[PDB]
Amino acid sequence: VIKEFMRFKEHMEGSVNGHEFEIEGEGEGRPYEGTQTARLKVTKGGPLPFAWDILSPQISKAYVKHPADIPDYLKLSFPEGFKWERVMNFEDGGVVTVTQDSSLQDGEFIYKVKVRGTNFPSDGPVMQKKTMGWEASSERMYPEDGALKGEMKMRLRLKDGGHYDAEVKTTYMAKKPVQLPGAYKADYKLDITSHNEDYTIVEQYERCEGRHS
Ligand SMILES: [Cl-]
């Protein structure tokens, strides 16, 4: 059911520091090569009053290149699919938590996402929009408690020139008990490839590849 080319559709709804929004997206990629692009639009509550960059990693692990000998748990979860839940703790006390459902219908991946951001300082780089995308990330993947966990430190580049840091923990759970992998790493790079002024229209590109640790 996972072809060498696959599209996806995404609906995200959320709030950050009280500001409500919805985003719709359509994307496409090559799941066995670890590569994907997407076009996204803010459909309600745009222009966003905070950094797009805190949303970009919430907006697709079906598209991770896996060697032969690492069970690709997330592809094997389809057509039913998988749920994930995440928390990002940012250095200045900001917090993002995400709940997500992924499935496959009519030959395309369907993503349904709920995002809540809170406690970001008003004078911070997130509410002031002073960020400049993510550095490459390596996610520590390991089985625990019948689910696949991931942990990562992410570094958001700052326009003034430093970095702004977040510690991340996610639980990924297939809807049927398909084969969990052993411990490994997933190397990411995510790039914003286009945005309009106010970031109500945004394109992204991501590559991700798994490897033994
Ligand atoms: Cl169908």
Author numbering: 7 to 65, 69 to 222
How do the authors describe this structure?
Transplanting the AYC motif into mPlum to generate mPlumAYC resulted in a mutant protein that was completely deficient in red chromophore maturation; i.e., red chromophore formation was essentially undetectable by either absorption or fluorescence spectroscopy. The absorption peak corresponding to the anionic red chromophore, which is at 588 nm in the spectrum of mPlum, is absent in the spectrum of mPlumAYC. This variant instead displays peaks centered at 396 nm and 508 nm; the 396 nm peak corresponds to the neutral green chromophore, and the 508 nm peak corresponds to the anionic green chromophore. When excited at 508 nm, mPlumAYC displayed yellow fluorescence at 527 nm with a quantum yield of 0.02, and no red fluorescence was detected with excitation at 590 nm. For mPlumAYC, however, no such peak is observed, indicating that the intermediate blue species does not form and that the second oxidation reaction does not occur. Thus, introduction of the AYC motif into mPlum prevents red chromophore maturation by inhibiting the second oxidation reaction, which results in a dim yellow fluorescent protein containing only the green chromophore. The structure of mPlumAYC demonstrates that the intended π-stacking interaction between Tyr197 and the chromophore was successfully introduced. The centroid-to-centroid distance between the Tyr197 phenol ring and the chromophore phenol ring was 3.0 Å and the interplanar angle between these rings was 12.3°. In mPlumAYC and mPlumAYC-E16A, the presence of Tyr197 blocks the space where the NZ atom of the Lys70 side chain in mPlum-E16P and mCherry would sit. In these AYC motif-containing proteins, the side chain of Lys70 forms three H-bonding interactions: one with the side chain of Glu148, another with the side chain of Tyr197, and a third with a water molecule. The AYC motif therefore appears to lock the side-chain amine of Lys70 into a position over 6 Å away from the chromophore.
